[PDB]
Amino acid sequence: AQNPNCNIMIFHPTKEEFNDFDKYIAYMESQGAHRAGLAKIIPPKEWKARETYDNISEILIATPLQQVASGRAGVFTQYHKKKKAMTVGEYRHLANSKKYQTPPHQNFEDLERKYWKNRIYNSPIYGADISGSLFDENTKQWNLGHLGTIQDLLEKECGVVIEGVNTPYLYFGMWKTTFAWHTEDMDLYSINYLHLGEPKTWYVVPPEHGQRLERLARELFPGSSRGCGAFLRHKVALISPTVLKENGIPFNRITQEAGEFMVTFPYGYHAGFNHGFNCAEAINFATPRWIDYGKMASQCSCGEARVTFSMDAFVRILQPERYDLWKRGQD
Numbered sequence: 001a002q003n004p005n006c007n008i009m010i011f012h013p014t015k016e017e018f019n020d021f022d023k024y025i026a027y028m029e030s031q032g033a034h035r036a037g038l039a040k041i042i043p044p045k046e047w048k049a050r051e052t053y054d055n056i057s058e059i060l061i062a063t064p065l066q067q068v069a070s071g072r073a074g075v076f077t078q079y080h081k082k083k084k085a086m087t088v089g090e091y092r093h094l095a096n097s098k099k100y101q102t103p104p105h106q107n108f109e110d111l112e113r114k115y116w117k118n119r120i121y122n123s124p125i126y127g128a129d130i131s132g133s134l135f136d137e138n139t140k141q142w143n144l145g146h147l148g149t150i151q152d153l154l155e156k157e158c159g160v161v162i163e164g165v166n167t168p169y170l171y172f173g174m175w176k177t178t179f180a181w182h183t184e185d186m187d188l189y190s191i192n193y194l195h196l197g198e199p200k201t202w203y204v205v206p207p208e209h210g211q212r213l214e215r216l217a218r219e220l221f222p223g224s225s226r227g228c229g230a231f232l233r234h235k236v237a238l239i240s241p242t243v244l245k246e247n248g249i250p251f252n253r254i255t256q257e258a259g260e261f262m263v264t265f266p267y268g269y270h271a272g273f274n275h276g277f278n279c280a281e282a283i284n285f286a287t288p289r290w291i292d293y294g295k296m297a298s299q300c301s302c303g304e305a306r307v308t309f310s311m312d313a314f315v316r317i318l319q320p321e322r323y324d325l326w327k328r329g330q331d
């Protein structure tokens, strides 16, 4: 079995290997990459996403979110407070202000120490889930707006034609902006491209060990667990690497820099934080190997998780027994 320790693998495709997206994912999996839950892909030196990022300041962040924490430094939740709209240029100035800017630090490990020590004492502001793309239409390789759709994959594998669409989303981050422990909707893959700015540090649990993370989370967040048998779908809970190690949970970490792609694999729990002002693009995708994970994905039916239109068909076709309860949680 390839990659039995579930290490995060880093790939350097050539320009020729960068042509066929599906084929390269299947290649990475042939080398065991999915066992980690996360892989990094460094694009060939000849590739670019677009010509420049000099003209993005007028994009609107309609509903910036202030991420307010509660708990202790290593075990906390966050809630999202809505703020007034602002442009990307206004958000960048805010990220760089004395109140929000990255502190002085020696290296990525020092900054990670500072994040876990001090995150809860601040409330950074995040632009999230903004439908759109920064890939040039003429970028033919790994263009996250031109991927094969999840609805087409389900039709190809299973024969069922369904409604729904699959488009990318932009993220604008600052120092201490935080992504809580989660798997993707319907335990899909994700791909994330860091277009510009400062890094993102990721934490990930191997898919084969995801239930260990879920059991710790029920212990650490006991009222949330009584409220919902899939409360990690709410995307609010954080657990530090130190707490994970104290509890024996297998995990890995890596820092993504501008110009790099990350792929998350089905049922790979992940979390992380941004180092400073940045912009990322991400989208969910599927392969044939996903189908069996989609059929088994947990679901939130308490009402908290609320998701896109296109998830309806995935539940309806893959999880007909669960569909009526889940749809009630959507309404």
Ligand SMILES: O=C(O)CNC(=O)C(=O)O
Pocket: 171, 179, 190, 191, 192, 264, 270, 280, 281, 282, 283
């Ligand atoms: O960049 C982000 O904020 C979040 N992205 C992810 O959790 C992802 O691609 O799975």
Ligand SMILES: [Mg+2]
Pocket: 055, 056, 057, 058, 059
């Ligand atoms: Mg603009």
Ligand code: NI
Pocket: 182, 183, 184, 190, 264, 270
């Ligand atoms: Ni994710």
Ligand SMILES: [Zn+2]
Pocket: 227, 228, 229, 230, 231, 233, 234, 300, 301, 302, 303, 304, 305
């Ligand atoms: Zn729920």
